[PDB]
Amino acid sequence: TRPRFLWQLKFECHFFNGTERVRLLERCIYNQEESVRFDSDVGEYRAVTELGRPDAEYWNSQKDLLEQRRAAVDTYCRHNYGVGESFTVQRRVEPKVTVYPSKNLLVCSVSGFYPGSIEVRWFRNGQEEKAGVVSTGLIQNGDWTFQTLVMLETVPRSGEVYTCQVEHPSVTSPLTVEWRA
Amino acid sequence: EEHVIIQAEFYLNPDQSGEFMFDFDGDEIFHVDMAKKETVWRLEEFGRFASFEAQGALANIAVDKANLEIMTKRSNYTPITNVPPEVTVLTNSPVELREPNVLICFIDKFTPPVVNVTWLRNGKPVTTGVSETVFLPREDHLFRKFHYLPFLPSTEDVYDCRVEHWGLDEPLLKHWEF
């Protein structure tokens, strides 16, 4: 029941098309209210709320620190991008694909993949079924993998083969798992 | 397309709790363990590809603490509003009897960043074998967190992820069974 008081500082490096365009957003947040920020597109501190006004004024009066902050897209954002690139931007983990009837409802389970961009498609006798398709969407597991469920509503015939197909940057040929019963 | 790297830090009173972490596209690259004063990589392989000087983060946290104390007074001692967590329990992969798997407790959209998380197997707490991430940042300046429990699936056993936060009226129990 003791009251709490929280301060957060965030340096956000935003990268567009590799390091072609970089934007730094430094944010100060008291409790849940962002109070002051440095935006590299702006080039100086701006207060977001009345709380941040003394900070914007005072910090902007410091010319060397402002000039270092303006260089930060290079000395900081692009630098750290360069260091982490091979194991972050370039990280590739191959999905595990499982197909099973749901506990008339077929489930394609795709798990343990990275990065998050993926295309999952359902086939019935080699032809794509685009209707009756429901997806759980992207799920971040917190350990640098994602998972997803893609469901197909069907009425299975006796000799039908349903195939789940997974396109992902980690696999040069899209993966396929067949199901029939 | 777009990538984002965030250096996210916090200090919290009266708990005197600090955090320093890097986030890439919503995943933790590393954090600094305040007690041990050491860099801890989220995927331990990252530690063979890069280094990070823990002392710089400790200096930052001391700045954060001092800034929090200034703001606390300036806000006229306005405390944070508790926002309770949403809790979701899922598994690493489709469960198969006896095949090692992981229960994942996803705790999301909450502040302040203090939570008590306990796994329950058949009503009884699980005291060893668990692991967890630090608090991860959100764009709305709330937090998320993941807790993990490796297990052997079995229709017999049941599990709950029990979550306590000042924003809740009582422990939140998210249930799972084969």
């Binding site: 900070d55 | 063979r48 590809f49 890069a50 000087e53 710089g56």
Partner: peptide, 15 residues
């Protein structure tokens, strides 16, 4: 007075 914290840097390891 309110202090500006430092944007900190990772550095690459040999291999």
């Amino acid at each position: 007075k309110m202090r500006m914290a430092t944007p900190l840097l990772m550095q690459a390891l040999p291999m």
